[PDB]
RNA sequence: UGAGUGUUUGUACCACAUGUACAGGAUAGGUAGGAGCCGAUGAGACCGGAACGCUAGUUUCGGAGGAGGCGCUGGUGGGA
């Protein structure tokens, strides 16, 4: 039913005991038994119900230490905006004409960022990106007049956080390779952004449960106060 | 059935006037152009 | 759903006089009353189309699926697919969203804040009404009432009375509502079609208010019966 | 003004099980990670039983046997 490695990780972990932040990051680094640089992700179960229009949350947060993986950037820009993209070093710089080739081409670029003026032309492709979700979203800040901030944030490790319908929002704080302190720092950044994102209409305890886990390791409950 | 009614100014919602009307003869809310002292001009007043 | 001291009088003939009602959640309420009792009027109050002369009518924030007693055909040339598609707000939001994009090109740095906020909500709202529905509706007809696809491209005004009732009922389901307000959902249906409607409403987990003059149909679904009195003007 | 039994319950943990529309290899619940994962701590495939079942199949227990399969990849789909 369960691999011996996962069972050993389970005996390390205690479901009843909600670890502190430092304890949780260390325990995740311990639990990722499989020999690859697995990611570390934290899940927050917010009380809010996304079915309500206001309750649902969708944003982008810059991680100071990064995700542990480089991110390919696609920029939709024209003229001076293309110049900004060139300065930032976008993995791809394109225009309304290059979107046609981008359709079916140069896929796997981590995030798309289009100028406001471009969005009108870019939307046609975006409807294809819609199901992919790649389409830039202003709330996340992807749609912006200037793409220099977007590109540097992507390189810095900007993470897009979107609450799931069931109310559990997941986000990768960093790779197991990252120092546990940097993972904890990224986790703290995630905690602060969620608090600031807490909608006004929310009532009661904001977060029902916070868990940390690696790609392979089991889930570890973490105290919200810590 | 004749009842006392209040005519309220539609512009400012001020219950400016009191009158009466026969409900059977005038089933729908009465409407008259009357001077609204608050707004100091003629405005449409509709029964409330 | 709750109403207190409800009052409503169209001209000289009154509908509600200090009427009250409280409906708990997850109640399949059967609304009964003679013609003109004011059964349809209650839904208009719930939908906020009408306003009580006096009193308070309280409705939950959940989304409401309304099945009108009369079919609403805005234009004679509307096709069945256009009529059904209008159930979901996908098309309406896209037209607004397309305009938002137009404004973004025209306006450089003046209205961007307002436009950007409006665009974000539309995208988030559009995703909430997942745009995959285009395929789901096509198959919702098949699984619902064996509605042939030839009708799907035919003007709605040309359908038969029984056919229109199937389309309207399907349209309500297409909207994916949270509370069901059904006003005579089986008015023109034949025996076979009524069977499907009954089974779905029995299985339907949410709250469903049904205005019906079919006693047998109601008995199979209703757990609570709300009677609108014509002489006492009460509930 | 306190002990028990039993029945009936409303609620919260904890185990369990279910997710079959169109297409898609076919039984596709969502989100995120995911190229690597799993198996002599007994794999694949075979067989019976039981369960579910939309009738397609799927879930699971077991007999033997002893070492394999799975995923990425590929197309499909809105979604793999
Ligand atoms: N604008 C109006 N002006 C005058 N009378 C009205 C108006 N609206 C409603 N009424 C009256 O309200 C009364 C009851 O309202 P309602 O239409 O809801 O009855 P009903 O029970 O739904 O009818 P049925 O069951 O036959 O479909 C109607 O008989 C109608 O005469
Ligand atoms: N003016 C019309 N133009 C085009 N097609 C029509 C027209 N009238 C009817 N049809 C079609 O004729 C078919 C049957 O006609 P009819 O109106 O007699 O149905 P019906 O027997 O009355 O069914 P029911 O009364 O139960 O709804 C329907 O598919 C209907 O869509
Ligand atoms: Mg009626
Ligand atoms: Zn006035």
- Give the DSSP letter string of chain A: ---HHHHHHHHH--SSS-B-HHHHHHHHHHH--SSS--EEEEEEEES--TTSTTT--EEEEE-TT--SS---EEEE--THHHHHHHHHT-SEEE-TTHHHHHTTSSTT-SEEEE-HHHHHHHHHHHHHHHHHT-S--TTTT-S-S-SHHHHHHHHHTEEEEE--TTSEEEEEEEETTS-HHHHHHHHHHHHHHHHHH--TT--S-SEEEEEEEESSS--EEB-S--
What was the experiment behind these coordinates?
Answer: cryo-EM
Cα A1 to the center of its chain, rounded Å: 31
CB A220 within 8 A of CB A31: yes
Q: C113-139: b or e for each residue (b if 16 or more CB lie within 10 Å)?
A: eebbebbbbbbbbbbeeeeebeeebee
Determine if ligand 2 sits within 6 Å of the CB of residue C42: no
The protein footprint on chain D, as nucleotides within 7 A of a CB, is 14, 21-22, 29-39, 41, 77-79
| Rounded Cα–Cα distance for residues C223 and C173 (Å) | 21
Give me the CA A11–C1' D62 separation in Å, rounded.
30
Domain that holds residue B13: 1-48
Cα C167 to the center of its chain, rounded Å: 13
List Cα–Cα distances, A224 to A185, A207, A208, in angstroms. 14, 8, 9
Describe the crossing of helices C161-174 and C133-145 by its angle, rounded to 10 degrees.
130
Sign of CA dihedral A143, A149, A151, A152: negative
Determine if ligand 2 sits within 6 Å of the CB of residue C158: yes
- Scanning residues 129 through 148 of protein chain A, those with a beta carbon under 7 Å from any atom of strand D turn out to be 131-133
Domains held by chain B: number = 1
Residue nearest the C1' of D29 (CA based): A166
Q: Is the CB of A224 under 7 A from strand D?
A: no
Looking from the CA of A226 toward its CB, the CA atoms found within 13 Å total: 14
Q: Which contiguous run of DSSP H or E holds residue C107?
A: none
* Nearest by Cα to A174 from A210, A225, A208, A215: A215
Resolution in A: 3.0
| Rounded Cα–Cα distance for residues C7 and C52 (Å) | 6
Q: Do chains B and A touch (3 or more CB pairs under 8 A)?
A: no
| Rounded Cα–Cα distance for residues A3 and A218 (Å) | 12
Q: Tell me how crowded residue C211 is: count the other CB atoms within 10 A of its CB.
A: 24
| Rounded Cα–Cα distance for residues A99 and A134 (Å) | 13
Q: Which contiguous run of DSSP H or E holds residue C226?
A: strand C224-227
Residue A44: strand pairing partners: A169, A210
């Amino acid at each position: 039913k369960k691999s011996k490695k996962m069972q050993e990780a389970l005996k390390k972990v205690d479901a009843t005991k909600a670890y502190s932040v430092e304890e949780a990051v260390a325990l995740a680094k311990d639990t990722n038994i499989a020999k690859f640089d697995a990611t570390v992700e934290v899940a927050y179960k917010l009380n809010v119900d996304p079915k309500k229009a206001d309750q649902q949350i969708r944003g982008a947060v810059v991680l100071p230490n990064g995700t542990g993986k480089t991110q390919t950037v696609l920029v939709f820009a024209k003229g001076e905006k293309a110049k900004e993209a060139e300065a930032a070093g976008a993995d791809f710089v394109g225009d309304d004409d290059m979107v046609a080739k981008i359709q079916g081409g140069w896929f796997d670029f981590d995030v798309v960022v289009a100028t406001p003026d471009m969005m009108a032309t870019v939307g046609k492709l975006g409807r294809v990106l819609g199901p992919k979700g790649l389409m830039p979203n202003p709330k996340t800040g992807t749609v912006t007049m200037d793409v220099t901030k977007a590109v540097e944030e992507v390189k810095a490790g900007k993470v897009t956080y979107r609450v799931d319908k069931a109310g559990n929002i997941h986000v990768p704080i960093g790779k197991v390779s990252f120092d546990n302190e940097k993972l904890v720092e990224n986790f703290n950044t995630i905690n602060d952004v969620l608090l600031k994102a807490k909608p006004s209409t929310a009532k009661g305890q904001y977060i029902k449960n916070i868990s940390v886990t690696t790609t392979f390791g089991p889930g570890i409950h973490v105290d919200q106060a810590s | 059935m004749r009842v006392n009614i209040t005519l309220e100014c539609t512009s400012c919602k001020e219950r400016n006037y009191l009158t009466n009307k026969n409900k059977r003869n005038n089933p729908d809310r009465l409407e008259k152009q009357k001077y609204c002292p608050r707004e100091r001009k003629v405005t449409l007043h509709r029964e409330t | 759903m709750r109403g207190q001291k409800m009052n409503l009088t169209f001209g000289l003939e009154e509908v509600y006089e200090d009427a009250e009602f409280h409906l708990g959640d997850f109640d399949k309420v059967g609304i009964v009353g003679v013609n003109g009792a004011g059964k349809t009027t209650l839904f208009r109050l719930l939908l906020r189309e009408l306003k009580l002369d006096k009193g308070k009518i309280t409705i939950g924030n959940s989304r409401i699926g309304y099945l009108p007693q009369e079919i609403i055909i805005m234009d004679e040339k509307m096709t069945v697919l256009e009529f059904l598609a209008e159930g979901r707000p996908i098309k309406k939001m896209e037209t607004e969203l397309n305009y938002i994009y137009e404004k973004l090109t025209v306006v450089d740095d003046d209205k961007q804040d307002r436009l950007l906020k409006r665009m974000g909500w539309l995208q988030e709202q559009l995703e909430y009404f997942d745009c995959y529905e285009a395929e789901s509706i096509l198959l919702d007809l098949v699984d619902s009432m064996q509605i042939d696809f030839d009708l799907f491209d035919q003007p709605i005004s040309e359908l038969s009375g029984g056919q229109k009732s199937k389309i309207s009922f399907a349209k309500v389901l297409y909207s994916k509502p949270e509370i069901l307000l059904l006003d005579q959902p089986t008015n023109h249906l034949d025996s076979s079609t009524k069977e499907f409607v009954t089974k779905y409403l029995k299985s339907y987990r949410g709250s469903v208010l049904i205005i019906s003059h079919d006693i047998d149909f109601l008995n199979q679904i209703i757990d609570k019966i709300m009677y609108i009195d014509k002489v006492t003007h009460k509930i």
